[PDB]
Design a protein around this ligand. Sequence first.
Ligand SMILES: O[C@@H]1[C@@H](O)[C@H](NCc2ccc(Oc3ccccc3)cc2)C=C[C@H]1O
Length: 331
Amino acid sequence: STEIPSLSASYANSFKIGAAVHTRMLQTEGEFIAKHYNSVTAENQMKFEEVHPREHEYTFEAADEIVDFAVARGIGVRGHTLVWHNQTPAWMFEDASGGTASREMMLSRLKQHIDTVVGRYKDQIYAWDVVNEAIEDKTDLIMRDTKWLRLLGEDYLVQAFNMAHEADPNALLFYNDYNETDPVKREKIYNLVRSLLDQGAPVHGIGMQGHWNIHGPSMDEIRQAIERYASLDVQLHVTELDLSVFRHEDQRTDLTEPTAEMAELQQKRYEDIFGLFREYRSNITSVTFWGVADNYTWLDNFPVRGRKNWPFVFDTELQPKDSFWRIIGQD
Ligand SMILES: O[C@@H]1[C@@H](O)[C@H](NCc2ccc(Oc3ccccc3)cc2)C=C[C@H]1O
């Protein structure tokens, strides 16, 4: 579209290159997106609260527009989170008295939601994040204490995957999570999917969120996670990749642009990462960035409200950053 090669095309024989999108960027960044991405994920417009605000009311307008945009351009679409403890309306977990919904209610409601959401795009979504972030970060805790686990039951994951698989048996069903490289959590995610496959659950892939930063995880840590998850004979997708220039609970806030140090480390960081992905392209079939360009990122408001970040290879003006050129695939 100017002087830079299509990022997605440079990986056409390696793995998809995708981005998290929102309908608001389609009428302005649609061309840029179609040029550089052969996959898209709705950042939020396909989550439970966004498509099923009320029990008897579905609002698919936004998600439908994203799908029409992609499908008409040969662009793949990943469905994000059907079951997650966040961005899920309260009515789903409540009964008529405002009390907690029963197991039977949870099941019938989850069934209807899945059939409607997954069934709507039957054969159009190549991959669905069936369950998102079910494992704890606490060293001594395996399963995250959520309303799905409490009101539906310990088999809520098996339930979710089975219902989604019936709504569309051709879509790849993924289990998505973050801090997937941390040794302790890695083994928990590994044992989860492992146990699921053993139960006969239709889980075909593990989603490595990739919410990393210019300081970690290291190459070796990512390498072990890759090989570990891959050994399960499932596909691996990097679903929400971003490299924050800030660390956890970062105290810095006077930055209008990355420092020279940040820019240098991020550039080298992206190079090493995609170098690693190419090495494992046999296991990785899709790599999605949680955003299009630095002009917008969910990180600008999380975990610090109003703190600008620049975690992508494209800058605020949609121009390729130095990291872009170091990430161009070999096809
Ligand atoms: O849907 C994605 C989601 O999967 C992602 N998880 C990453 C993540 C998970 C937990 C987390 O931890 C906290 C959550 C709330 C409050 C404090 C910490 C921080 C990031 C975030 C972006 C969303 O668009």
